[PDB]
DNA sequence: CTACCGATAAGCAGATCTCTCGATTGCGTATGA
RNA sequence: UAAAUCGAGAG
């Protein structure tokens, strides 16, 4: 379970050759289903991605107690920031590759690192 | 010593029986034993009205608000 | 869960005109005039009433929910299918509201345009002896805001006073859940057992 | 008696209660409230209290809710008018908040209840006892940090920040909103960005985690312990993760997600573990 | 104008509309203290025994000025009256009493 | 019923009520009747705006009885009340603006293609 | 409906169609005449004056307006007065003596015509400790009657037994029907509502009410007076 | 408890890299990002182990039952 | 300007080396502030603590021998005076000596209880004041929590604490017992002292008395124990005071209380009662009727000494009035031991005001100009602290303790023994019989 | 006048899906040592 | 290997 109470069970062990790879050779450990948010709306877990995504990539840790953002400094936007200018996509996309087929899939997958 | 349908002592406090239940001619304090008579009393008004959350009606809903 | 800068502008300007719902509802409720200004004290006697009885609390609660239920409905209806950032199909949340994969529109627009009003068994929140909803909020309050309705989406997060509103109102569903799961067996048992 | 009522604010962490049968009921504390375990010295407090202009309660002659009536952690005091009551309340809360009478302790709760038109009962009823329930709020004149308890609470205006303090109407003002919640509900990351039944889940689910329980295994006899082998901090946490020193138990580990419906076998809630990063150490525990 | 240390009034409370006849008089009991010095009321009556008592709890914080005032000239004189929880008690039925411990 | 280390009354002072009206104030602990609303005594200040029955020496100055006319209530009950200076809300100064999530500055280019 | 069978429901009601040339008028008027009305509706409070001088009892019950409640709820002055005379007194004279036995254990008052005389003469005669009796048949306002008591019996509240009486009291009211809400037609369907089962009480009102389609709440009332045929429609209806 | 030997996501060796990384943190005034730059971790994959290890086996060592306290 | 840290390196110092003062977070050991204030402000703190209060409030038990004083003769006072626990000892045998220190560690190895024994002192009188024979009994292991005052652990460092295999930063207020941690659970309650007007239903529906309305309060004694003091409504216009001393509950008329515990007339309760408000007819009315029944159903109650002995007498064997207290004594202690405890002994007239207030607000609750406080909103609530619960039951054991000697004593009676209240050998053989494992 | 028939009011009787773990088990007493 | 009661609970 992720820190936004998202149970699950691991359904299958996926070789890593079938995992689907990323463009700098990540991949991933740990897939969620996309369907469960809409119902859910923890919109923290996607906000939550991103922000240790761009942590993981500065090197540097980003506080998470509620009530420090607002309607006018949008934590998807002030990480986006961030994400932009270490280099990757402003809106935690990612391009990525399916393990078997080989081929781009066709639109760039959100990844992240949450705890 | 008089508020009401009660009647005091003037000297110690107690309640002095009602009028109506004592033989007559006087009152009888049942702590000082000091006596009052039956007169400088003699109507014992009260004047009581029921709550307004007596009776809810519909009529006194449109009185209201 | 984005939206273009100019669905967001009409956002905020629908929720500008959300100021005066809650005062315009109980200034109806009320049975005074409006343009009554919030803090008309034969205004607040009249809300200490309509809290003191149960009935009347009920009333200005509908009415109110109903107004910014209304306002909610427009904010729905101009945002959520041609104001986002990404359109259909692209849109994912979209993709799986509308194919019934998962979720629904409502849902949708939680978490995109508007959290709308909070109801934990239809009414509006509980109050305090003295008339406050929330300790941060004057006593007898005339305010949309301060009566259980909440302006924000779970994209852009929620004030303290909203979250407190929306905890209580997942704690209601919490309850409700244990409740729904527990009241049938006996009914479908002596049914079952008459009929086999 | 399971509904969360508004008068809990900052003492009974709306977001901390189990699912279930207990929902409602064992809730848990605020991370910030404390609860007075001695008693304060009440002594002087009425000889300041008569001073203040009350009538002593020994001749009175006064009852009922048409007067106020000053208490003291259950006894009466004096009889005083009703807007002078509200005035006594304000100057004792403003000696108390400031630091100089010995007599008024910061821990005394003074609640004051105005009269109204069918409302609670008016008085002035001042608390100094073992057992109460205290949160520390920050007292708008002179910026210092006040205490109050719940029922000196509800009757009164507690701005939650800064910026929402209004003319004439806010008396105090909370230090940060985040210290009305627990402790495992101040660590959910961005906790204003979820649905309130998933941060339910959230916090009954971190008692829950397979982590480390202490450090001292070696020299205990548990009958049944779960350790977690490697374990990492966050990348992201709240300011208070190293307030309490959590990171001594750290709880689960930093994994990259990947939100993406690719493999099939995860619809509803189901996961998929990457294999490579299982065999390689990922999760393993004792 | 001027201050008496030396009691000079005293004032009790006993209920509204108290009434003796002239002949009932009281006493006064005087502790030996320094400050805060507290007064006891003792009456006499035919039939009633009237006594008299003070808290030390509230009389020490706080003091009660009685004093006369010309209606057109300023002049005042303060003095000392000790307020009392004053009641009044049966004379006959004070000592009444019982059997201890009943068959 | 009279308790031990408790002295009695050996004389007191004529009061002369007829001379008029009698008043009762309710003066604090801390006041010290010297050189006698908002009146101030003394260095601190105070707000000042039949409960009890009267009593007064008889002729032989060694009995009491209760002061009256030919009972008596007093004209007016003064209870002094302190006050305190409470001081004003400096709005500008406890209502700060809201601040900004504080960006990490330095924050310098670290994404490279593979093998570059 | 299905585990209990109760006979006794919650809140049992019936549908009464109506014929299509009843508009909302003389239909609403209808729905006023058929509801219940108690004592208690009427009354906007009463001032009870007590003497000692035995122990009297003057009850001054204060009058809505005649304007507003007769058209309000369709209740007549004639129509208080006789129900007030044959109802309220007797059931006050009641709830009194059963509260002294178990404690054992405006104007226009002089002027009263010859009928008013009467009125007063015999309601005294009807009933125990009634002295003086009148009624505002002017204007439907006020009503006085003094309580003339033994001076043995003790103190009485006279407000909360008075209470109860005014709420227990029925002016106008056919049996097992608490209310008539005529609610919104549902599809064209002009349909009145009552708030308890009774088939025969509209059965005599045949011009407002089409008795063709009374359907109602009930089960064991439609089995008792519909048979057993009606009873499985109405239980499949329900359960619907 | 101890820093993992290689990359849980991707597999590359970084558990010779903690003593070099607390190494550069104290006797450098190294900052955590450019620190792990200068490891060679270059994706965040690699770099959020050793960025967010804890290092439990040293509070674990002080309770030993084979010698004298 | 990084919004957080990992404070990597501090935490690898701290890793390296504990603290040597000072735990290195202030707010973890805040959290269990509760458990930890409460006992040891159980034992330590003003007047000797809690636990002196609860032995003080006990009072003593009699019983009479065989010598025919009028009564049956050798007036045996038996009573504790002081109550002392000591932090946990070994006997290691009987080598005896020198007593080490037990530590939690090998507690918890152990698989038993951590417990340090309890020492209390009698005060065996007899005849009041003649024979004074004081012998201190340990009555088994009482267990103490962790980080307390009576705990090895209680002010030791980190570095100490992790010198003593314990935990780096061990913050624990639970208690071990069997070698199984166990933790006296928060509860919450009445608020104290404060009459809270009461609209319940259950009153009515199978209560004796006949309303849902009424006024309810929970006094606590200084030491730390509560008794609920229910102020009853009846619809034909009277209250009645309720309390419970036993697992049953009695019901009293609130006239014979209000003028048994101070002495007052009639005049000064309609006086209290109705403050200047002598115009409000449904109070006047109300007040009549209750004052009016009172002197009915006890006309013969004419004194302040005739309704304490009346109280006395009916109250006899429920309170356990042994021949040698007077009925006006035995009506003193009852008063004093139930009504408004929280005011204390020798606080009559608080006690006075204080129900008279309570009377004044049930009539304005029953008038409709009050609202019923929510017994489940936090607005009138407060938290037993799980160590204040230790003290309550500490001062029923020794109570139960002290009724087993005297029990002790009465079958000693019973049958044909010396019955000899001077004997040493004697006071052996029945302190000893007695089954006194206070700490099991 | 007095026996038979119902009509309340109080009491009596009975109701409000599977599985896994852990924990626990009484005082009183009375005579043979 | 029992049997009952309490707590944690899972769906
Ligand atoms: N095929 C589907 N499968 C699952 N959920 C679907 C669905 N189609 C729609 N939904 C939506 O899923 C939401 C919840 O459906 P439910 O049947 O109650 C499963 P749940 O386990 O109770 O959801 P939860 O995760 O909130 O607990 C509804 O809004 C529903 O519209
Ligand atoms: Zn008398
Ligand atoms: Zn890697």
């Not at chain 4, 230090?175 to 509900?185: C, G, H, K, V």
């Amino acid at each position: 379970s992720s820190r936004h109470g998202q149970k699950g069970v691991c359904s299958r062990k996926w070789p890593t050759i079938d995992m689907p790879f990323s463009e700098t050779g990540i991949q991933p450990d740990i897939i969620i289903n996309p369907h469960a948010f809409p119902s859910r709306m923890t919109i923290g877990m996607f906000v939550e991605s991103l922000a240790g995504k761009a942590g993981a990539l500065h090197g540097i840790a980003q506080d998470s107690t509620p009530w420090i953002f607002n309607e006018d400094d949008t934590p998807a936007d002030y990480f986006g920031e961030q994400l932009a200018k270490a280099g990757y996509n402003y809106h935690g996309n990612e391009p990525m590759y399916s393990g078997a087929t080989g081929e781009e899939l066709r639109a760039d997958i959100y990844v992240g690192v949450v705890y | 010593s008089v508020v009401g349908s009660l009647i005091f002592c003037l000297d110690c406090g107690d309640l002095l029986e009602n009028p109506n239940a004592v033989l007559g001619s006087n009152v009888e304090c049942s702590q000082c034993k000091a006596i009052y008579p039956k007169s400088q009393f003699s109507n014992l008004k009260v004047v009581t009205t029921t709550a307004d959350d007596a009776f809810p009606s519909s009529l006194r809903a449109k009185k209201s608000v | 869960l984005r939206l273009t800068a100019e669905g967001n502008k009409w956002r905020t300007d629908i929720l500008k005109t959300s100021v005066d719902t809650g005062r315009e509802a109980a200034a109806e409720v009320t049975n005074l005039d409006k343009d009554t200004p919030a803090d008309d004290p034969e205004l607040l006697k009249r809300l200490q009433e309509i809290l003191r009885d149960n009935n009347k609390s009920g009333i200005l609660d509908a009415v109110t929910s109903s107004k910014v239920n209304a306002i909610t409905s427009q904010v729905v209806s101009k945002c959520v299918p041609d104001g986002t950032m990404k359109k259909f199909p692209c849109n994912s949340m979209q993709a799986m509201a509308l194919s019934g994969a998962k979720g629904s529109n409502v849902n949708v627009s939680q978490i995109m345009c508007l959290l709308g009003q909070q109801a934990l068994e239809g009414r509006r929140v509980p109050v305090m002896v003295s008339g406050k909803t929330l300790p941060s909020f004057k006593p007898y309050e005339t305010d949309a805001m301060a009566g259980g309705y909440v302006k924000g989406r779970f994209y852009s997060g929620i004030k303290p006073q909203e979250y407190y509103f929306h905890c209580m109102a997942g704690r209601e569903g919490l309850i409700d859940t244990a409740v729904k799961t527990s009241r049938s067996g006996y009914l479908q048992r002596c049914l079952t057992k008459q009929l086999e | 008696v399971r509904k969360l009522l508004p008068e809990s604010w900052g003492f009974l962490c709306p977001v901390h209660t189990p699912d279930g049968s207990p929902c409602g009921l064992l809730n848990h504390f605020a991370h910030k409230c404390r609860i007075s375990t001695q008693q304060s010295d009440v002594s002087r407090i009425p000889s300041i209290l008569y001073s203040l202009g009350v009538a002593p309660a020994s001749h009175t002659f006064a009852a009922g809710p048409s007067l106020c009536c000053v208490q003291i952690d259950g006894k009466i005091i004096g009889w005083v008018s009703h807007e002078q009551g509200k005035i006594i309340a304000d100057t004792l809360r403003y000696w108390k908040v400031e630091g100089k009478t010995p007599g008024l302790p910061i821990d005394l709760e003074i609640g004051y209840v105005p009269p109204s038109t069918r409302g609670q009962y008016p008085g002035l009823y001042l608390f100094g006892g073992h057992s109460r329930m205290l949160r520390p709020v920050r007292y708008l004149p002179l910026d210092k940090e006040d205490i109050v308890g719940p029922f000196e609470q509800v009757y009164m205006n507690i701005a939650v920040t800064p910026q929402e303090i209004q003319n004439n109407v806010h008396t105090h003002v909370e230090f940060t909103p985040t210290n009305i919640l627990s402790i495992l509900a101040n660590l959910t990351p961005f906790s204003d960005f979820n649905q309130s039944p998933r941060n339910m889940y959230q916090c009954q689910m971190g008692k829950q985690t397979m982590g480390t329980p202490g450090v001292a295994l070696c020299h205990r006899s548990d009958n049944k312990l779960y350790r977690l082998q490697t374990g990492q901090t966050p990348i992201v946490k709240a300011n208070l993760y190293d307030d309490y020193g959590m990171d001594n138990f750290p709880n689960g580990f930093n994994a990259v997600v990947a939100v993406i419906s690719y493999t099939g076998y995860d619809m509803d809630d189901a996961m998929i573990i990457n294999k490579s990063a299982d065999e390689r150490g990922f999760g393993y525990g004792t | 104008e001027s201050v008496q240390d030396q009691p000079s009034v005293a004032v009790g409370s006993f209920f509204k509309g108290f009434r003796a006849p002239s002949d009932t008089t009281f006493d006064l009991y005087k502790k030996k203290k320094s400050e805060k010095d507290e007064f006891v009321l003792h009456g006499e009556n035919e039939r009633l025994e009237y006594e008299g008592y003070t808290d030390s709890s509230s009389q020490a914080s706080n003091q009660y000025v009685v004093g006369l005032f010309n209606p057109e000239k300023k002049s005042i004189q303060l003095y000392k009256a000790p307020v009392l929880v004053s009641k009044v008690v049966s004379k006959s039925s004070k000592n009444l009493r019982g059997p201890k411990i009943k068959s | 019923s009279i308790p031990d280390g408790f002295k009695k009354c050996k004389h007191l002072k004529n009061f002369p009520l007829n001379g008029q009206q009698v008043w009762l104030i309710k003066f604090p602990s801390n006041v010290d009747i010297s050189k006698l609303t908002t009146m101030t005594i003394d260095k601190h200040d105070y707000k000042i705006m039949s409960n009890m029955t009267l009593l007064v020496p008889s002729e032989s100055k060694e009995s009491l009885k209760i002061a009256s006319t030919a009972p008596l209530q007093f004209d007016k009950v003064f209870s002094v009340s302190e006050t305190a200076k409470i001081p004003a809300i400096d709005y500008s100064k406890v209502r700060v603006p809201r601040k900004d999530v504080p960006k990490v500055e330095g924050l310098k280019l670290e994404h490279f293609a593979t093998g570059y | 409906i299905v585990m209990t069978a109760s006979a006794a429901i919650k809140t049992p009601q019936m549908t009464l169609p109506i014929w299509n040339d009843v508009s909302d008028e003389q239909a609403d008027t209808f729905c006023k005449s058929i509801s219940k009305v108690l004592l208690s509706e009427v009354i906007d409070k009463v001032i009870v004056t007590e003497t000692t001088g035995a122990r009297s009892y003057v009850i001054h019950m204060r009058f809505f307006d005649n304007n507003e409640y007769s058209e309000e709820y369709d209740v007549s002055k004639e129509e208080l007065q006789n129900v007030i005379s044959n109802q309220f007194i007797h059931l006050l004279e009641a709830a009194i003596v059963k509260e002294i036995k178990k404690q054992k254990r405006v104007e226009a008052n002089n002027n009263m015509n010859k009928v008013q005389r009467d009125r007063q003469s015999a309601i005294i005669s009807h009933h125990r400790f009634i002295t003086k009796y009148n009624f505002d048949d002017e204007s439907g306002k006020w009503c006085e009657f003094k309580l003339e008591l033994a001076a043995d019996t003790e103190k009485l509240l006279m407000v909360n037994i008075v209470e109860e009486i005014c709420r227990k009291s029925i002016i106008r009211q056919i049996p097992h029907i608490d209310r008539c809400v005529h609610p919104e037609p549902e599809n064209g369907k002009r349909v009145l509502v009552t708030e308890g089962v009774n088939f025969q009480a509209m059965w005599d009102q045949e011009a407002f009410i089409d008795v063709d389609g009374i359907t109602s709440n009930d089960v064991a009332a439609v089995l008792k007076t519909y048979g057993v045929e009606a009873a499985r429609n109405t239980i499949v209806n329900e359960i619907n | 408890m101890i820093v993992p030997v290689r990359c849980f996501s991707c597999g590359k060796v970084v558990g010779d890299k903690w003593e070099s990384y607390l190494n550069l943190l104290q006797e450098d005034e190294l900052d955590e990002g450019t620190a792990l730059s200068r490891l060679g971790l270059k994706r965040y994959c690699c770099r959020r182990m050793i960025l967010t290890h804890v290092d439990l086996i040293e509070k674990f060592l002080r309770y030993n039952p084979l010698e004298k306290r | 300007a990084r919004t957080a840290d990992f404070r990597t390196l501090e935490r690898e110092s701290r890793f390296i080396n504990p603290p040597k003062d000072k735990s290195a977070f202030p707010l973890l050991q805040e959290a269990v502030q509760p458990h930890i204030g409460s006992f040891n402000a159980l034992t330590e703190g003003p007047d000797g603590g809690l636990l002196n209060l609860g032995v003080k409030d006990i009072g003593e038990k009699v019983i009479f021998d065989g010598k025919p004083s009028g009564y049956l003769g050798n007036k045996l006072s038996v009573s504790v005076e002081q109550v002392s626990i000591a932090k946990p000892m070994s006997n290691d045998g009987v080598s005896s000596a020198v007593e080490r220190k037990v530590y939690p560690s090998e507690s918890r190895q152990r698989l038993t209880s951590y417990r340090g024994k309890l020492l209390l002192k009698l005060k065996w009188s007899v005849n009041n004041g003649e024979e004074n024979l004081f012998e201190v009994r340990d009555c088994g292991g009482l267990p103490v929590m962790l980080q307390s005052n009576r705990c090895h652990l209680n002010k030791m460092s980190p570095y100490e604490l992790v010198q003593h295999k314990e935990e780096s930063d061990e913050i624990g207020g639970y208690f071990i017992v069997n070698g199984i941690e166990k933790l006296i659970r928060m509860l919450i309650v009445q608020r104290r002292n404060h009459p809270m007007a009461i609209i319940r239903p259950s009153f009515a529906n199978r209560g004796a008395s006949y309303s849902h309305y009424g006024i309810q309060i929970r006094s606590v004694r200084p030491d730390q124990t509560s008794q609920t003091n229910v102020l009853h409504y009846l619809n034909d216009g009277q209250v009645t005071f309720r309390f419970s001393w036993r697992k049953n509950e009695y019901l009293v008329p609130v006239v014979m209380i209000l003028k048994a515990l101070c002495h007052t007339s009639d005049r000064e309760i309609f006086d209290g009662i109705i403050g200047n408000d002598v115009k409000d007819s449904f109070l006047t009315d109300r007040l009549e009727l209750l004052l009016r029944g009172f002197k009915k159903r006890y006309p013969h109650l004419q004194n302040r000494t005739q309704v304490l002995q009346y109280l006395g007498d009916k109250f006899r064997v429920v309170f356990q009035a042994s021949p040698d207290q007077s009925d006006l004594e035995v009506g003193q202690e009852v008063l004093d031991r139930i009504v408004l405890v929280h005011l204390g002994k020798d606080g009559s007239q608080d006690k006075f005001r204080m129900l008279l207030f309570m009377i004044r607000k049930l009539y304005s609750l029953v008038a409709g100009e009050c609202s019923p406080d929510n017994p489940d909103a936090t607005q009138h609530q407060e938290v037993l602290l799980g160590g204040f619960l230790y003290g309550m039951i500490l001062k029923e054991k020794i109570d139960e303790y002290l009724q087993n000697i005297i029990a002790q004593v009465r079958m000693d009676i019973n049958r044909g023994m010396a019955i000899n209240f001077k004997d040493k050998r004697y006071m052996s053989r029945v302190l000893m019989r007695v089954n006194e494992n206070i700490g099991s």
